[PDB]
């Protein structure tokens, strides 16, 4: 019946529970470091000169 | 009495997951990026307008060259555009006009479209005959196709309203992997850069991280209050963002297994149809039902800009692989390139 | 002095603001960019010309008591005014024909009538008004061989001659009004459900626009016939009332044609 | 200016534009009908009469008018995620089986199939995407209903029913109970027909109702309505 | 299978008229622009005429202008060349060539077998292939060079020069399109480079199936002009 569906859900929850997690601070610092490392390569964040813009020029 | 014991062990496992998430939540993203400088005001203009579609545009996907793009509209046409010159490179008539999703292969040799027909049509763009013809019709799903992304020329992952996702081999035409677990209609998916993992957002207000090779659900992410319509990875593949009908966007971290940020405003009550990140991931662009597109600060949860060039709902949205431009497709039958 | 110039400037400012709000509602909103609205754009253009140019020269004619500006401008103003008013009335006629063919042939005619045929009908209406009125006004003096019109007064030279009078009155007002009446009668007949509120609403709109056109353009066109039957019957204040009534139709045309559509009504409030 | 290959690419784009315009005109000259109605309501019989997984499209031509009918009954997914695809259909045909007045839902115990049909009709009629879309209502199985009504009363379905227990009064009461569910009475009309099963009466009704819808839409376009 | 078959050749007298035909099969003919190219019996290739897809654009070479008329029948998949007032200089083998034009396309990619016509008895870009014969030995790497009187680099970034190989007894085959792109079905040993005015095709590890005449062609502006051709022979 539904007992196998419930067993599957329990097994999935166990697999999701038995993972290792880093601190939110560390992941936020990694995201911030990625954003500041590629900030000069983002044309949207920093407008490129009109000579180098394919759509504008 | 087995059922009650299974469901109590399930609620204990959910409490354990919630307590582990609370344990690793030592700080917030707003407390750490509180001292960085703000982006400023992002003013983007409409560089190009792509006219030709005569019905609502439901999906657009950029090509890896960052010049060619495919669009899908419900009149019954897929159009490959050259976005630099606004030239129509190809017009492909569809056998079923109820298309909801389109994809561009990374190589550039194929395109795919899925819809209410429950079939994924793979079209070959580089034929000796000079026309585009159907190369494959992937059948097997029992619900409409919502999103399809190519991993390579021979493998494609699709999401459906049958509550399941699938990995297909285009050569044999047979599902290679089936991803099950979602209890709601899967509305979107997004491949990781490396293409080893994909996230899927569904109508059960949850997102799931899937392993392509193993076929298993690694992590489940909750926090939304309604149907998750859109999902997209952060450029380094360690985070993703979801957009939903609750008028909020959320940023989730895979390694921390939690929600990091919520992008919302009291003056927004409409749902999010599409989400994408910029090249560095600093800007998060979300399409809404208010006929506008909002540009948010992905580290500070501030609204940095508005792309207001459409007369109807912004159904779809994509950022190029070099990050030079943003294309928005809408229900008013027009595609716009912004910069 | 100030009262008359104030009320005529107010009337011309309404005639200009309404028609430009109509044209801006057509250009801004894309739901109003249809084939049926190009005729409304042409009507709005003609009414803009009438309100901005003809009303001010008429109110300075009637506030001076005579025509100060001179003969050459008098011929130009008469020519332009008559051409752009007959173009407004041919625009009403082709609107009536387009509505008749959209209602009585609903499955075929909106496919056959493209943008090309709409532009052809608008251009045909404009050149028919031009060909009818401009050479008969500018070049009448060369025909007769001497201007009979006294200086300091501006009016039509050929009013005396009954043949051109009757032919122009027929071809400008009396023939389009019976065609418009017959076509709108058959529109209100063919608007009934054949499978109510719909027939009543469209017959109220039809009665409103027909009453507006008839009440605006019937005084002048019976004064013309009374003048050509009795040369010395009509006072000039009556002539003035007749001209002004012919002018107010341009003012009321946005409310009678554009503002019947609710999309125009919500685009007007958004300015 | 452009090179020679750029000029030829622009010419190819112009030809693509021309073919898109021609296909758009040919698609605009067609009538789109969305066929809804709960399961076992007679929809299949309707499709069979008109014609002589996923979404099924039936193409027919009656009196030089081309009709595309889209059946979405196989879509078992959430309806509110794809119903906005059908926002600009010409009309909706909803099929109701009269014989189901005293029957009950197999899936849900003690749930009258007529109440489920009324709930679905109220859901799509007052839907936010179908505000101006007219609805053609087909009340199927009049003969079966007529035979059943003599034995079984209408008061099983509607306890507030007070009229006669005959065919005409019960049929008019059922038609009234579907047509009063329309909240936006001004914007949309409901064309009700009792399917006759004879030769071309159903398609003729569809033709007449679609002609009335095309008239009302031309009136709205011409500003008269 | 893509096939272009030319008929209508033969001996003609001066001042006469003939109609050449090209039957197309195995591809969507109406979406391709078509060209007529001639080859004099001992000389190089010369471009004659061009009709676009949809017949909207038609170009002719100066030598044949006013005498030749190019046309196409798209329901019958046929290309026609009506030649009137023939001259002795028009004796040549005529080839119909398919070219499709869109971003990333490879024009001039299929050449028909050609039909033989025998007639009894200033600002054009000049492409120069200085050497006319290079003796080669299998296995080695060889460079063929072409130069242009005008810079073929356009402002859009494209350099419109095409490399073709004609084997002995066959029709020419497209090797390189737009200076560096390698054509479909061509082995990876062929490579094209250059800088605006001077260009080089490098064949690494030469095989016996690479002998024949190599032609450079510009596609920057009409009329299209070919090089004189560099011949590769063994020993
Ligand atoms: C010989 C006189 C015939 C009269 C025919 C109708 O009059 C017009 N046809 S075209 N424009 C007019 C106008 C006349 C005066 C006022 N103006 C604004 C309109
Ligand atoms: C308060 C109203 C005062 C009107 C005075 C001017 O009368 C006119 N309006 S239009 N044409 C005339 C004429 C004037 C002189 C004679 N001419 C033949 C007619």
Author numbering:
A (entry chain G): 7 to 63
B (entry chain B): 2 to 340
C (entry chain R): 32 to 226, 392 to 467
D (entry chain A): 4 to 55, 182 to 354
E (entry chain H): 1 to 121, 135 to 248
From the paper:
The M4 muscarinic acetylcholine receptor (M4 mAChR) has emerged as a drug target of high therapeutic interest due to its expression in regions of the brain involved in the regulation of psychosis, cognition, and addiction.
Cryo-EM maps allowed for placement of all the components of the complex including receptor, Gαi1β1γ2, scFv16, and two molecules of xanomeline. Specifically, the nitrogen atom from the dihydropyridine occupies a similar position as the nitrogen atom from the trimethyl-ammonium ion of iperoxo and ACh allowing for an interaction with nearby residue D1123.32, a conserved residue among aminergic GPCRs that typically interacts with the positively charged nitrogen atoms common in many orthosteric aminergic ligands. Here the hexyloxy tail interacts with S4367.36, while the nitrogen atom of the dihydropyridine core binds between F186ECL2 and W4357.35 forming potential cation-π interactions. Importantly, the conformation of W4357.35 was in a vertical pose, in line with other PAM-agonist-bound mAChR structures, compared to a horizontal pose observed in the agonist-bound mAChR structures.
